[PDB]
From a paper:
Like typical Hsp70s, [name] consists of an N-terminal nucleotide binding domain (NBD) and C-terminal substrate binding domain (SBD) connected by a hydrophobic linker peptide. ATP hydrolysis to ADP causes domain undocking and closure of the SBD, leading to tight substrate binding. Nucleotide exchange resets the cycle and triggers substrate release.
Moreover, in each structure, Ca2+ was identified in the nucleotide- binding cleft, where it formed contacts to both phosphate groups (α and β) of the nucleotide as well as indirect contacts to protein residues via several water molecules (inset). The [name](NBD)•Ca2+•ADP complex also resembled the structures of [name](NBD)apo and the NBD of BiPapo containing both its NBD and SBD. The Ca2+ ion in a structure of human Hsp70(NBD) in complex with Ca2+, ADP, and Pi occupies the same position as Mg2+ in a post-hydrolysis state NBD structure. Together, these findings reveal that Ca2+ participates in the coordination of ADP in the NBD, which is consistent with cooperative binding of Ca2+ and nucleotide to [name]. The NBD structures also revealed a second, surface-exposed Ca2+ ion that is coordinated by the carboxyl group of D257 and backbone carbonyl of H252 in [name] and homologous residues in the cytosolic Hsp70s. However, the IC50 values for Ca2+-dependent inhibition of MABA-ADP release from the NBDs of Hsp70 (444.7 ± 80.5 µM) and Hsc70 (345.5 ± 71.1 µM) were much higher than from the NBD of [name] (57.1 ± 7.4 µM).
Numbering used by the authors:
A (entry chain B), B (entry chain A): 28 to 406
The structure:
C-alpha cells in the first residue's frame, strides 16, 4: 500500500516517501539521495543504472544513454528532437515517425529502445532504492513532469512507469510539486507563485496561482538548453586556454584529460556555492604533466555573468504573459541544484527588490518532496 | 687523487669508480647501488640524505626535499619553475630572481637553501659512499647533466660539487655517458645513436653522432614530466576505485593508506618487469580493513597503454629534427629504471622494425658507469 514520490529529472532523479507525518528522501545503495538519470550497456552485457552508468561514460560514450527526458513522448519531426540528436553521443534512429535509442548490449547484439524504455530503467532503480529502504514492494508512484509537457509526453512517462512495474497513479507538474513541498497549497486566499527551476541542462520559470488549495499554471518560460553544464563549460574553456598559456599543452584532443578536468570543475563549482575559493588539482593530467589552479567565486561569476543575467529575461516574460507586475508575486520558489549558486540567488532577490525566496527544503530534493506529499495523500 | 663518476639524477643518484681495469658501481651504507636524491630535516635537527630521507617523507612532507634538479640553475621567471613549485610539498620562495627551498631545520629555526645547496648534500652522500669503499678521501668527480642543460644549470651543478667539497673536473651529457658505458665512443666511422632515457619523473630522447670518438648532440626531445611515477599513478587510481567498489571505503582522505598503497604499487610494477603477476597485500590498510589484489602485466600495460605509446612521438621528432630516417639509426641505447618495462622495450624495437637495443649494462647504473669510465681517463 506504499505510494512513493519520484522526481524523474533530465540529469538526476530523486525518490521520497511520506512516513510518520514527514517526507523521507531515500538514499540509494551508494548513499546518494539523488541518482543520475543515466543507463549504460557494457560489452560484457551488464546493464548499469545511475552512478555506475555515469562513471563509465568516458570509456563507453556510444552506449551510455542520458537526457532521454529530452526525447520522451516526442515525434521525430519535433524541431527539439532534430536539434538534440546532433549533440547526443549515442545513436538516435527514426522508427514509425519516433526517435529510438540504438545501443550495443553486448554478445554482438544491437537493441533499439524507446525513450520511455530508458526512463523505465531509471524508474526501476528508484523503485529498487525505495524497496530496499522500506523492506517491502513498491508498485505505485506519483511522478513529476515539466508544466509544459503535452498529453503524449505525460502518457509516455506513465508508460515508463508501467514498463518498470510502477502504477503511476498521478502525473503532477514540477513547479506545483515545488509549491506543495513549501506548503503553499495550505496558504489561505489567492496567491501568485514564481517558481525558478535551474537544473543541470534546463531552466524553467513558472507563474502559478493558488486558490483555496487549487493550483493553476498561468505561464511558463525559460531556456530548454541552459543549466549547470553551461556554467561548467565556461570554466572548462577558461582553464583549457590557461593551461596552453602556462605549459604550452593543448588538452582538447585528449578525451581522458578533458573528462578529468570536467569532473574537478563540477566539484569546484559545487564548493564555490558555500566557499569563495576551490583548488583544482589533477596528478598526471596530460603527458605526465600535472594540473593545479585555484578558482575564486569572483572568477566563476565573471566567466558566467552574461548567462546568470540571462535567467532574468524569462522571469520578466512570465510576468508580462500573466499580466502581472513584480509587486504581484507573493512567493518566490528556487528549486534545482543550480539555484544553490549565490549570484543566482542575489540576481532573483535584486529583481524582486530584496524579497526573500522560500527556504527550508533542499533545492534538488524539493520536487521529489512535493511528489512524496501528494503520494502520501493517495496512500 | 681518485676521480669518481656521479649520476646526479632527478629521483636517484649513483657513484662509480674505474679500478683494476673495470667500472665498480659503489653500494651505499645500506648496500644499495643507487641512492634517492632526497634530503630531510627532522624536528630533532638531524639532516637525513638518501634512503633515510625518502623513508620518512609521509610523516614529514613539508621538510623533505626532492626534485632539486628541476630547479637548479633556473631563474624564478622560468615557466618550468612556475609550474613545478605548485606540485612540490616543501616551500619554494623567490630571493634575488631565483627559487630557494625554505624548510624547518629544528630548534624553532627556518633555513632557505639554493637548489645547488640541496644537490650539494646529495653529492656529499655519494662522496662518503665512495670514500667508505675506497678507504681514502675523494675530492675529484665527473658529474652528468641532461644534454639540454644551459650554462647556468651546468655551473650550478659545479657549484653543488664545490659546496660538497668536490672539484667537478668535467660536466658530461647523460646520453653521452650512456653511449660511453656501451663503448660506442671506441667505434670507427660516423654512427647515429638514439638514446632513450626514461626515469622516475622525466623522459629524455637524444640523437648523438659519434665520429671516431668525437660526440655531437644533434637533437634532443622527450617529456620533462613523464616517468615511472606516472605509471604508478595510473595503477593507484585503478586500485583506489576498485577498493571503493569492493569494500565501500574511500582511501583518498587517508594519506597513511595512500602512502602504503603507493609503496606496494611501486614494488608490484618493478616485479612485473620480470614476472606476469604481482600480489599487492596490505594488513590493516584502512579502518582495520585489509587490502589484497593481484596486478597482472596485462592490466599494468592496459592502464598505461596511452603513456607507453606517447614515448614514440619524441623519438619520431628527434629523427625529423636530425633529418634522419629510422634505417639511419646504428645503435639504440635504453637507460633509466623505467626502460626495464618489457612493453617499452617492445614498442621501441617494433618502431625500429625489430632492431635490438644495446644490452649488457644495468640501465639503472649506465649513466654513472659512463661517468666512471671518463673519470678513469682523467685519473
Ligand atoms: N552546490 C551546488 N552549486 C552549484 N551547482 C550545483 C550545486 N549542487 C548541484 N548543482 C548543479 O545542479 C545541477 C543538477 O540539478 P538537479 O535539479 O539536481 O538536476 P536536473 O538537471 O535533473 O534537474 C548540476 O548542474 C549540478 O552541478
Ligand atoms: N624493474 C623495474 N621495472 C619498472 N620500473 C622500474 C624498475 N626498476 C626501476 N624502475 C623505475 O625507474 C625509475 C627510476 O629511474 P632512475 O633512472 O633510477 O632514476 P631518475 O628518476 O633519477 O632518472 C622509478 O620510477 C622506478 O620505479
Ligand atoms: Ca547547454
Ligand atoms: Ca609526471
Ligand atoms: Ca531538477
Ligand atoms: Ca636516471
Amino acid at each position: 500500500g506504499t505510494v512513493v514520490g519520484i522526481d524523474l529529472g533530465t540529469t538526476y532523479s530523486c525518490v521520497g516517501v511520506f512516513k510518520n507525518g514527514r517526507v523521507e528522501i531515500i538514499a540509494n545503495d551508494q548513499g546518494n539521495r539523488i541518482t543520475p538519470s543515466y543507463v549504460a550497456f557494457t560489452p560484457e552485457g551488464e546493464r548499469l543504472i545511475g552512478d555506475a552508468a555515469k562513471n563509465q561514460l568516458t570509456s563507453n560514450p556510444e552506449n551510455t544513454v542520458f537526457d532521454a527526458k529530452r526525447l520522451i513522448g516526442r515525434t521525430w519531426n519535433d524541431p527539439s528532437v532534430q536539434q538534440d540528436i546532433k549533440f547526443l553521443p549515442f545513436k538516435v534512429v527514426e522508427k514509425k515517425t519516433k526517435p529510438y535509442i540504438q545501443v550495443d548490449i553486448g554478445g554482438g547484439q544491437t537493441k533499439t529502445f524507446a525513450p520511455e524504455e530508458i526512463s523505465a530503467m531509471v524508474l526501476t532503480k528508484m523503485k529498487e532504492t525505495a524497496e530496499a529502504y522500506l523492506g517491502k514492494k513498491v508498485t505505485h508512484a506519483v511522478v513529476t513532469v515539466p508544466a509544459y509537457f503535452n498529453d503524449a509526453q505525460r502518457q509516455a512517462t506513465k508508460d515508463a512507469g508501467t514498463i518498470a512495474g510502477l502504477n503511476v497513479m498521478r502525473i503532477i507538474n514540477e513547479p506545483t510539486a515545488a509549491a506543495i513541498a513549501y506548503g503553499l497549497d495550505k496558504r489561505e486566499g489567492e496567491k501568485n507563485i514564481l517558481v525558478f527551476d535551474l537544473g543541470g541542462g534546463t531552466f524553467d520559470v513558472s507563474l502559478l496561482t493558488i486558490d483555496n488549495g487549487v493550483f493553476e499554471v498561468v505561464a511558463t518560460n525559460g531556456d530548454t538548453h541552459l543549466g549547470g553544464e553551461d556554467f561548467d563549460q565556461r570554466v572548462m574553456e577558461h582553464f583549457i586556454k590557461l593551461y596552453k598559456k602556462k605549459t604550452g599543452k593543448d588538452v582538447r584532443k585528449d578525451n581522458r584529460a578533458v573528462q578529468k578536468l570536467r569532473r574537478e570543475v563540477e566539484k569546484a563549482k559545487r564548493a564555490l556555492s558555500s566557499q569563495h575559493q576551490a583548488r583544482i588539482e589533477i596528478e598526471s593530467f596530460f603527458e605526465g604533466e600535472d594540473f593545479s589552479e585555484t578558482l575564486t567565486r569572483a572568477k566563476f561569476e565573471e566567466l558566467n555573468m552574461d548567462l546568470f543575467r540571462s535567467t532574468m529575461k524569462p522571469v520578466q516574460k512570465v510576468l508580462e504573459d500573466s499580466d502581472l507586475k513584480k509587486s504581484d508575486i507573493d512567493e518566490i520558489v528556487l528549486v534545482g541544484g543550480s539555484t544553490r549558486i549565490p549570484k543566482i540567488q542575489q540576481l532573483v532577490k535584486e529583481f524582486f527588490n530584496g524579497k526573500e525566496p522560500s527556504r527550508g527544503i533542499n533545492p534538488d530534493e524539493a520536487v521529489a518532496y512535493g511528489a512524496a506529499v501528494q503520494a502520501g495523500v493517495l496512500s
